[PDB]
Amino acid sequence: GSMEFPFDVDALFPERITVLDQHLRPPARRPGTTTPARVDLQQQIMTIIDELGKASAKAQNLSAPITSASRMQSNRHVVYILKDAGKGAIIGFIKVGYKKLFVLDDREAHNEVEPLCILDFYIHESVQRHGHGRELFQYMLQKERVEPHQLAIDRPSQKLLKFLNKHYNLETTVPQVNNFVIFEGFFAHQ
Numbered sequence: 049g050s051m052e053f054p055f056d057v058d059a060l061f062p063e064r065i066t067v068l069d070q071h072l073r074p075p076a077r078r079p080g081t082t083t084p085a086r087v088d089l090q091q092q093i094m095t096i097i098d099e100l101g102k103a104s105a106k107a108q109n110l111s112a113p114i115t116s117a118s119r120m121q122s123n124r125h126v127v128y129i130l131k132d133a134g135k136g137a138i139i140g141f142i143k144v145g146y147k148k149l150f151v152l153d154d155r156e157a158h159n160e161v162e163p164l165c166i167l168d169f170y171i172h173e174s175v176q177r178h179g180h181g182r183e184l185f186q187y188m189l190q191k192e193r194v195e196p197h198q199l200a201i202d203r204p205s206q207k208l209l210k211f212l213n214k215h216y217n218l219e220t221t222v223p224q225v226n227n228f229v230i231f232e233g234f235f236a237h238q
């Protein structure tokens with residue numbers, strides 16, 4: 049069963065996919081809604097992002113999370129949170145950001161670029177492989193306004209590489225020495 053919290057997630061996140069940045073801005077509601085204080089709502093969001101980061105860390109066999117509320121506030125990352133039993137539940141998230149990279153082309157030459165990067169990506173195990181990952185990824189691409197092949201991927205797992213191959217035909221890679229993966233077509237757009 050997906051991730052449940054001691055507060056009303058549906059009240060907190062009206063949309064199915066919630067977009068948050070360093071501001072950690074609680075989504076607007078409608079007038080009928082009375083609301084808890086903003087500081088409290090932000091704390092709820094901070095807890096959600098902390099727990100998501102930890103769960104993603106467990107899924108990826110990481111000894112420490114790469115996504116946290118604290119990290120979100122001190123960086124320029126964007127998280128897209130997919131939400132799902134009165135309290136509501138969280139299915140998963142994807143986190144992106146622009147990063148400066150020293151990238152190898154097909155001629156083993158290093159190029160300074162700053163592409164959009166897929167930094168963290170997680171769907172709760174109970175409902176993995178149900179198409180939820182694609183749902184998040186499609187929404188992100190649209191909002192971020194980028195093509196799949198324009199992306200750099202930070203340490204992509206075996207699951208993600210299949211995911212990208214199936215859904216976007218990202219198959220051929222240009223080997224890197226950092227732990228980022230780029231795909232054929234990455235440099236044409238550069």
Ligand SMILES: CC(C)(COP(=O)(O)OP(=O)(O)OC[C@H]1O[C@@H](n2cnc3c(N)ncnc32)[C@H](O)[C@@H]1OP(=O)(O)O)[C@@H](O)C(=O)NCCC(=O)NCCS
Nearest residue numbers: 169170171176177178179180181182204205207210211214
């Ligand atoms: C990677 C992840 C976000 C994929 O999201 P998802 O909701 O499972 O993916 P979707 O259901 O939208 O797409 C299904 C496709 O993803 C890939 N995939 C998902 N789970 C897989 C598994 N257990 N084994 C192999 N491929 C898998 C496959 O290509 C699959 O297609 P298929 O089922 O027809 O073979 C999710 O599986 C996950 O959270 N994995 C663990 C954390 C992780 O690896 N994150 C990325 C690290 S950079």
Ligand SMILES: [Br-]
Nearest residue numbers: 115116119120
């Ligand atoms: Br973060």
